[PDB]
């Protein structure tokens, strides 16, 4: 069935599973035409397919040429996503294929189920958590590869860099979603936090800076304060007055659809 907070540890068990987020597949800018009408211009997009246990990210780049001459693009985008996820699964060795695919948006359920009819043992599930995977394009190295692509392309990343050498996948996923929620909430301030200190750098083969265990604790705290600050800014709430239990409660509520 659906995936939420009660069965959350299931994400980090030994059954292969993938999250699929389609929010950046079909990306447009809206602008006025010379005649004063409105028109869209698409830009390259991507399918975000993530193994939460391993950190393996299958980033399928969606080149704008795929929309050429097509109608009802927002609907096509879901079916194109399902087609590409299905093709990914078929490309993987049997012992690497997922047992479950969790979609971040309920509108992907029927497109993926129909594309995966040949895999009746793969469960297709929605999720009540508010996952911030749309902010993937806020990670500079991912945004760069998407915008530079001149053709469809699949790129493989480890979105946890080397963190699993030091922490569990439960903690690594929590870190990830906290970083991505901060980037979607206040991208400028989030990136400022991540790069302020020049002496900590991003390895050529990594997406995020090379923080020590202690520095990650500091970064994580700054990210939570960033999100809490925005919460205060958004709803005109005095966050200084809030108790720790209230703050924990506000976070749990804000992380559910």
């Amino acid at each position: 069935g659906a995936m939420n907070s009660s069965n959350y540890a299931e994400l980090f068990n030994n059954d292969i599973k993938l999250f699929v987020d389609d929010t950046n597949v079909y990306r447009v800018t809206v602008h006025k035409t010379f005649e004063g009408n409105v028109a869209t211009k698409a830009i390259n997009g991507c399918i975000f397919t993530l193994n939460p246990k391993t950190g393996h990210l299958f980033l399928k780049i969606i080149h704008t040429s795929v929309w050429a001459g097509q109608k009802r693009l927002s609907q096509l985008a879901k079916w194109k996503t399902a087609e590409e996820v299905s093709a990914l699964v078929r490309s993987l060795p049997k012992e690497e294929q997922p047992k479950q695919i969790i979609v971040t948006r309920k509108a992907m359920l029927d497109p993926l189920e129909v594309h995966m009819l040949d895999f009746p043992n793969i469960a297709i599930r929605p999720t009540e958590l508010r996952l911030p995977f749309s902010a993937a394009m806020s990670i500079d190295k991912l945004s760069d590869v998407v915008m530079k692509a001149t053709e469809p392309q699949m790129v493989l990343f480890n979105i946890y860099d080397d963190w699993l050498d030091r922490i569990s996948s439960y903690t690594a996923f929590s870190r990830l979603t906290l970083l991505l929620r901060a980037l979607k909430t206040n991208e400028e301030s989030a990136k400022m936090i991540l790069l302020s200190d020049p002496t900590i750098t991003i390895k050529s083969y990594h997406l995020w800076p090379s923080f020590t265990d202690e520095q990650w604790i500091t970064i994580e705290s700054q990210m939570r304060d960033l999100i809490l600050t925005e919460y205060g800014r958004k709803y005109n709430v005095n966050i200084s007055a809030l108790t720790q239990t209230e703050i924990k409660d506000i976070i749990l509520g804000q992380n559910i659809k």
Partner: protein, 300 residues
């Protein structure tokens, strides 16, 4: 005109004959139904007065044999049987007619209702949905499940309607996933009509039979099948014009006949609003749309 005599009526029962119905009292002198119009299938059905559980009945065609009803006190129900001795049967009927022990099938001469509900239903096709080949007639009841229901438990007592499932490999060509899911014309025209049913008359027959089993027995799997067969047509962009015109007529007479008080359990709100207002054929069912809106505007 033909006759279905009754040996007797030992238990109080509401008897149905097609869309008509009458009450018989415990051990009342009732010996059957006469003047049954030749040319149509018929259904004689029962609901016991002391136990409304199990509506049940028999589909039959008087051209295929001489049938009568006899109560079975061991199995506790009225059973249809065939009489092979022709001279015995005629003499039994004539005696009961002389003694006026039979109700007359009450067909108003203006009334094409039963024809309109059974235009495409043939006994031979009923006998393939209801498999009991030693009898020329077919028993159906309230609780019989359909093959599709069983897949989702006794197979000999099941309704073998054609399985319709929009998210199955039968409905969806590999490589045409979006196309076939949003436009069911492949599944309708190639799989179902050309492949399984061979023509639209057989398709409509099964549709009509499903409705009548839903209405007369409260059979839930039949109601599912009826709605599935409607939706399959309405959700197809490409339907022969004559099938759409005939579907409109078929549904009109079904909606016209449905008891008003059973609308909440016999009509699926999602399916009908989808078929009338969002589907490809949303504007192809003028007569059905007009009677539905004037008779069941709540459902919409």
């Amino acid at each position: 005109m033909n006759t279905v005599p009754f040996t007797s009526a030992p238990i109080e029962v509401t008897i149905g004959i097609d869309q008509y119905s009458f009450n018989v009292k415990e051990n009342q002198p009732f010996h059957g139904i006469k003047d049954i119009p030749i040319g149509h299938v018929h259904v004689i059905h029962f609901q016991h007065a002391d136990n409304s559980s199990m509506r049940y009945g028999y589909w039959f065609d008087c051209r295929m044999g001489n049938f009568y009803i006899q109560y079975d006190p061991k199995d506790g129900l009225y059973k249809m049987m065939e009489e092979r001795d022709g001279a015995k049967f005629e003499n039994i009927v004539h005696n009961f007619k002389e003694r006026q022990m039979m109700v007359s099938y009450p067909k108003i001469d203006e009334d094409d209702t039963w024809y309109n509900l059974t235009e495409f239903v043939q006994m031979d096709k009923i006998r393939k949905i209801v498999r009991k080949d030693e009898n020329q007639f077919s028993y159906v009841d309230s609780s019989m499940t359909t093959v599709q229901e069983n897949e989702l438990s006794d197979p000999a007592h099941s309704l073998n309607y054609t399985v319709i499932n929009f998210k199955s490999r039968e409905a969806i060509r590999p490589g045409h996933e979006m196309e076939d899911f949003l436009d069911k014309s492949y599944y309708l025209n190639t799989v179902m009509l050309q492949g399984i049913f061979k023509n639209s008359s057989n398709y409509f027959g099964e549709l009509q039979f499903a409705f009548l089993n839903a209405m007369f027995f409260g059979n839930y799997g039949s109601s599912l099948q009826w709605h599935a067969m409607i939706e399959l047509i309405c959700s197809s962009a490409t339907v022969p014009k004559h099938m759409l015109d005939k579907l409109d007529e078929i549904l009109y007479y079904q909606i016209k006949t449905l008891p008003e008080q059973y609308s909440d359990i016999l009509l699926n709100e999602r399916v009908w609003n989808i078929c009338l207002y969002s589907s490809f054929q949303k504007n192809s069912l003028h007569n059905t749309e007009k009677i539905m809106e004037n008779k069941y505007p709540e459902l919409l």
